[PDB]
């Protein structure tokens, strides 16, 4: 798996022949702690009546586990959990690769996976946070053969997106329960701010489970942890070799 991790359900016989519909929704985009997950849901077009009962608009942790059990013959899923170390390395690398472009390349990957597995996908639904105009145009150019639809209210608009959101939320919960007292994980939480400060190493800093790339994670390090400077913040022979005559000792 290395950085990310893909967990998938076997393709049901109906999906490869009958025309299908895809839904994309995320979980764990804002916390400083833990990994980010991305989940997709696919069902044949006539079987949209069955998913009309397991659609939201919010739901409690016990209800989301119950909804995930029912989805688990016609409904297929695929996950993509990106580790907090991978997120830290993606953004903190010599070339800035922002969370928006990190989340959206994970979305296009799972859609390609479904097309690589043999699912007869004809239309794709996507859930966003803010302006979908720039997001729709990018995924329409990536997948020209299929009708791409991006909405911010997608989870509350269509059952395919709500089912893909329940799958992303349960996987995010299962992963943090596997690691387990911090609180929620979000930067705004005062109990989360209290946990980070109590887990700072002067040389190293925070552990792998902490997304360093966050403005909240970068600020604390500047106060408690030691100052670390990186590559981006004849006489010719030795200057080229980086050598000089000793005088310090």
């Amino acid at each position: 798996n290395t950085g990310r991790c893909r967990l998938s359900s076997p393709v049901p016989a109906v999906c490869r022949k009958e025309p299908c519909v895809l839904g994309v929704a995320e979980a764990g985009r804002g916390p400083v702690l833990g990994p980010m997950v991305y989940a997709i849901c696919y069902c044949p077009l006539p079987r949209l009546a069955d998913l009309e009962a397991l659609k939201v608009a919010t739901l409690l942790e016990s209800e989301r586990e119950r909804l995930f059990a029912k989805m688990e013959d016609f409904v297929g899923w695929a996950l993509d959990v990106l580790s907090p170390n991978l997120i830290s390395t993606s953004m903190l690398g010599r070339v800035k690769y922002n969370l928006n472009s990190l989340s959206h390349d994970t979305a296009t990957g799972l859609i390609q996976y479904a097309l690589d597995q043999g699912v007869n996908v004809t239309q794709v639904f996507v859930d966003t946070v803010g302006m979908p105009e720039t997001y729709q145009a990018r995924l329409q150019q990536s997948f020209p053969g299929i009708e791409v639809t991006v909405k911010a209210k997608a989870a509350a608009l269509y059952p395919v997106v709500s089912a893909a959101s329940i799958c992303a939320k349960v996987a995010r919960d299962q992963a943090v329960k596997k690691w387990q007292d911090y609180g929620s994980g979000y930067p705004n939480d005062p109990k989360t701010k209290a946990w980070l400060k109590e887990h700072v190493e002067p040389v190293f800093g925070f552990p792998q489970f902490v997304r360093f790339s966050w403005r909240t994670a970068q600020t604390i390090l500047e106060k408690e942890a030691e100052d670390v400077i990186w590559e981006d913040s004849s006489h010719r022979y030795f200057l080229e070799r980086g050598l000089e005559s000793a005088t310090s000792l």
Binding site: V203, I229, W230, E231, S234, H235, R236, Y237, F238, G242, L243, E244, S245, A246, T247, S248, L249
Partner: protein, 156 residues
């Protein structure tokens, strides 16, 4: 904690079968008493580097080298000023008089002998540049190497 130094010393310094002194640069030195030999110190200082020694950190990323030295370059400043601190122990070593008969009871500095001796080192460094393969054009390159160990190179 305390300051740590990452050194690269010659293999023969392990067996007993040494002192560090600050001698004036011809253009820190290590000297042996039991073996009688002079060595120079060279530090590798690169921008943005730090060591991870066992279970401790050491900023700077300094790499020290204990490389040998021909005393003829070190003792040269004593007779260069005439033209025609720890310096005392530097000269008083066995086989110095026979070594002196290249540059200089009585001792006098000569330019004609020094010019012939420096011309041999250029031809001696040209083979090292051919053995270690450093990137004929070697003439000015080999001349520039001895220029960092002597002030008379401006006249040469």
């Amino acid at each position: 904690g305390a300051r740590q130094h990452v050194f690269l010393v010659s293999e023969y310094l392990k067996d007993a079968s040494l002192m560090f002194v600050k001698l004036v640069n011809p253009c820190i030195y290590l000297f042996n008493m039991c073996l009688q030999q002079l060595f120079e110190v060279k530090v590798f200082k690169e921008k943005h580097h730090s060591w991870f020694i066992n279970q401790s950190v050491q900023s700077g990323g300094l790499l020290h080298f204990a490389t040998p030295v021909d005393p003829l370059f070190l003792l040269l400043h004593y007779l260069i000023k005439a033209d025609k601190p720890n310096c005392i122990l530097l000269l008083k070593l066995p086989g110095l008089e026979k070594l002196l008969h290249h540059v200089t009871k009585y001792y006098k500095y000569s330019k004609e002998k020094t010019l012939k001796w420096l011309e041999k080192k250029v031809n001696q460094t040209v083979a090292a540049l051919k053995t270690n393969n450093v990137n004929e054009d070697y003439i000015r390159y080999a001349h520039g190497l001895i220029s960092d160990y002597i002030p008379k190179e401006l006249s040469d």
